Amino acid sequence: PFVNKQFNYKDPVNGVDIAYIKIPNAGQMQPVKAFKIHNKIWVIPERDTFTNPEEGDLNPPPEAKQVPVSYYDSTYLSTDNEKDNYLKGVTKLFERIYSTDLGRMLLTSIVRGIPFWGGSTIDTELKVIDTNCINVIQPDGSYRSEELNLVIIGPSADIIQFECKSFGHEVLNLTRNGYGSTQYIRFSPDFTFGFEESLEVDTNPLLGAGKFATDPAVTLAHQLIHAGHRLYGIAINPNRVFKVNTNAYYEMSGLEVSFEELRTFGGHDAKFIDSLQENEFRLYYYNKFKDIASTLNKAKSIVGTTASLQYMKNVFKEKYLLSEDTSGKFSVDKLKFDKLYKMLTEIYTEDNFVKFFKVLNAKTFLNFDKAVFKINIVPKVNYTIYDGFNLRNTNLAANFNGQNTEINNMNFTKLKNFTGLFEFYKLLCVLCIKVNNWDLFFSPSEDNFTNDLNKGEEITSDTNLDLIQQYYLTFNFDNEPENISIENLSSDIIGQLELMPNIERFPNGKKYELDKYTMFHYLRAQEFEHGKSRIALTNSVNEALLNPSRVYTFFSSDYVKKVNKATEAAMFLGWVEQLVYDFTDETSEVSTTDKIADITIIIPYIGPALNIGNMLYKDDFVGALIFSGAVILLEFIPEIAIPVLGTFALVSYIANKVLTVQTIDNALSKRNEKWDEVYKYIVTNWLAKVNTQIDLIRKKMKEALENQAEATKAIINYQYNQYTEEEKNNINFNIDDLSSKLNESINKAMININKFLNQCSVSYLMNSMIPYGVKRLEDFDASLKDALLKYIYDNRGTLIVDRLKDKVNNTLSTDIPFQLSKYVDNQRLLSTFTEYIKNIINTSILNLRYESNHLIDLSRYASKINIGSKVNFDPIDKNQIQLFNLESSKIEVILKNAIVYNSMYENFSTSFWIRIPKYFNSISLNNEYTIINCMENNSGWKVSLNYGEIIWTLQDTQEIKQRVVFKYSQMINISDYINRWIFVTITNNRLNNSKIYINGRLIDQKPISNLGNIHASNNIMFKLDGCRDTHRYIWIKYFNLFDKELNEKEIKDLYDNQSILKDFWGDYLQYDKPYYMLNLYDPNKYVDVNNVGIRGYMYLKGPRGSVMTTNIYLNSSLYRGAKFIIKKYASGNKDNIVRNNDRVYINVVVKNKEYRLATNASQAGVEKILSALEIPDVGNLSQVVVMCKMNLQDNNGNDIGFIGFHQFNNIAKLVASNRTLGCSWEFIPVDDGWGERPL
Amino acid sequence: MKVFFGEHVYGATINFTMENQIHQHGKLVNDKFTRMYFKHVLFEDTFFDECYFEDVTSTDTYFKNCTIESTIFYNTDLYEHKFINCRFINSTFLEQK
Ligand SMILES: *[C@@H]1O[C@H](CO)[C@@H](O[C@@H]2O[C@H](CO)[C@@H](O[C@@H]3O[C@H](CO)[C@@H](O)[C@H](O)[C@@H]3O)[C@H](O)[C@H]2NC(C)=O)[C@H](O)[C@H]1NC(C)=O
């Protein structure tokens, strides 16, 4: 434990862990209680009324602070029970943050960061800072001064205001010059924020409403990261503020966000800053550390302490990771400085802690907190010691229900925030309305982003989850500076807090006159007061806004006509079922017009709901969006401008041979780096000025749907109240089920709207942002190619030649693919981007797919598709084609007479999947035979197979043959290239090269520039031709042709795209079928049974052996061990196909009799030895397994463990335990294509 | 020493121990050697066929120029070095003592 010996509250005043204390302050302060909790950390159970003199009262100020939410209380912390609970909670939060390894490293970093003793006016002396120590007064009467790092004090006047403060100096800015000082954290554990999250429905479609409470551990972690930044003296200047534009009506009035907050939030927010400012900060901090190292080198004396100067120098060199070269000459190395800076900046982030804790948190700081919740942490029945609010084994663990207020309501109590709902407001008029400040768009200014693109560059000879665990492994421990004796300072420690820059109060009540309706008017037109009078829906905002009793709706006229009708007792159940069904009908509508680029699901009713673009018609909105792209959604167009990129200058070493090649190599490398940097700048600009508006629109849609549901159930309850006693008792009704079903409809509509906004943002990025960069960037490539050309000839030859020009023409004529995988994390965004490119590029030349009981081309170009009589199709999946070595085992494809050119194929590609059986007959050696033909009259291409190799042949009219080959050996213990499903693709640039790719990996390139004219085949042939084997047969599926050359990016994702679990061969795993077993970690062994029963067990033995035939193949035996069978437990699918997340039972065949697999989870140890039992077993033992990995679950739903093996003594037994491997397995169905003989 | 020429052993299960023999041009078809001892016995030009070897223990025996087809060598000590210039066909080699 990090916190031993819990200190209660009424323990005595011994003096080393509990004592009375003098804090530094400007004036006089009385003795104050606190409890030492660890080395160099203290916690003070009192309100912060001593550090700042201006805050002498706890009354809410007349001028409320510009904060989204805030609560005030003056009797809190007053009594001793509150002090005890406060201290218990803060201790629990410290131990919880210490529990996680990342938090453990952060706590160690906090401990080690003792401030520098640079307070001596004389340069060569070390003196402690007077303002970074605490005077501990002993019961005897005297006091001792002691240094420390952190102080935890109850909140300020504004209770929920958690912050970090430091004690400054007259001339030294400690927090930003590498010295650092003690930090005071104004914090409380008893209160939490309450925010709203609407991006969880992807994981939990059954989620109800939001209103989630942030884990107080995360807030304490944020405070600790602020502290950690301040101890190492690397805090960013507070006056550096991410300024925003505030002139417009739709622009948020104003809010300060310093760059230190952006750094500490990390993750998505950390991308709001460009690389240039980060580089400036890094250089400045490196210079400051060089300065402190120089000062430490200069100093040779110390006054005011007992221990040696050498000991303190050792402590400081460990704190700053400095290096001394055995000569008393300290120096910092760029590598260790970079590592430490990355650890303090990029590793220690709020996002990483949220990911590790598995708790809800707002992904962006824009999602302002909306409530204050009183909580209780001291009891363990409310907040578990390990997993936070999400207690395991309970209903709260699932779906992250612990943080949901509406479920875990007995834990959270809502409080009335003292910031008015409309205290900070803006006025909009056309009929005037008021808007809260925190519900407006966030418009960053252009000044916050800068570029060094214009600056020219010269090149010389030499120019240039897991990572957390590697850093933890590399991290150092056991070195915590011991407590030190110092000469005591005065009775009173004078000192002033670090001065905060002044922020002027932003104006309130501004009036804006507009000639059009803004979306705020529409959003207000749907609210109501839920008075006694009847409320009526309407389709005109002009009346809904004016009349308080009339509420606007964007639904169809029949809906409002129905909801305005009075009905009788017998009719109400039909009325409510009709209205809920109809409501689902409008909420589920999606447009079918998909000719627009990757906006596949256009949702119309967003138009009249929020008045996007100033139309009130669904069809008009659809037309406007189709015409104008995603621009119309944005409230204001974000200006993007890429100035001319600087040129590149190369130095010349007269008569050089190998340094010049280095110069060209470095030129290429810097070209790649420039491309990467400009993509990064474009992405950060997009994320800063595009995503926020989309997020706000999504939030407005969510609240609009909720308001519509509110009005509907309000009018329904109004109608319900009209009845007399007999009707209401005879005819029952409740609102809970209606609320649940309406919320579920809201969620299913919200999934569609969320996805729609996702493609809107991605399409806008791909369409109206990247071309501006790419044009200037390819102009830069043109200039660079010109420079490299001038150097490659230079009208001289004293150089080092066709290879260099080939390389420069190759790389500087093509484009590097653009992906956000290397720029963004938001998983939702990631999927949309890639899925889009591949899905759209699917449409191509031939899309031969077998659906609707026929083999057809979905690319509507193929003329006719001939099917031979001797072809075969797989009953389990009709899309597989099996071809035999017979004449009628043929498939002819009549290629479109349109796309047939003599000199076509300039840039094009093919891709498909092949399964090849295992070669048996020795005559097949060197027996080349064509499998796919598009060659006529000695010109075309052909795919052919031979003994363990695939051959792609291109052939022109003038005899110039070009053969590219991919080979594999048959004499290997484990093969990925025999009887397995293999993705094969061929890319062709008739200008430069032909490339081959297998399952998405690079194999071979050959030049095809010497190729001339390659006339196009009339048709496509699918037939074995020239294969001497009388039994040879193939398997092929998903054949596709691409009219343009492909690239590594579009080919790799394609593999996964075309990729329901699969077997060893890649075919669909099937139920009620036997299967052998194979673990990837240990391939050379097989599974075996022993004395089956509760005492019985499965184990790993071998070797599996070997089956071979001379000079044809050698391979280890595969049909070894007892076969495994899988059958349905609760899957409702009629077919025997298994899919992901299917809970099924597992049985094994032993001497031709079936056994359940099950184990007793109550056995000691995390490892759970499985056993083979008879079918009449006992249901208590866990036997349900979910689905290439498999996980055993308890009968109550608890996961027993991932099925794997453990080396139990000398026996490799099988376990279900909660290793980088051992969770990988493989099923081997009996296959006729392999041919090994069982027995 | 017993010299054997032109044998055709069909569907025979061998259990006992045969010692001090040489076989030439043998055609051992669908045989079965289970739990037996090979002692100073030599095989030359013999054509096996789907024979089964189980718990066979060999001493100074040596296979030469034999065509061994569709056999199983399970729980045996007939290692690789006991085979000289032999062609396997569709055969297998299971766990060996
Ligand atoms: C080694 O083993 C392989 C496969 O285990 C043997 O090849 C197989 O030989 C059989 C017998 O001719 C083929 O069966 C065929 O079945 C069809 C359909 O019923 C029938 O019409 C034919 O008349 C024939 O009986 C089987 O297809 C074939 N398999 C392959 C992959 O070729 C092989 O003969 C064995 N020996 C050698 C030296 O390879």
Ligand SMILES: *[C@H]1O[C@H](CO)[C@@H](O)[C@H](O)[C@H]1NC(C)=O
């Ligand atoms: C081998 O089997 C035969 C036939 O069943 C039997 O007579 C003989 O006793 C067995 N071998 C030995 C050495 O017991």
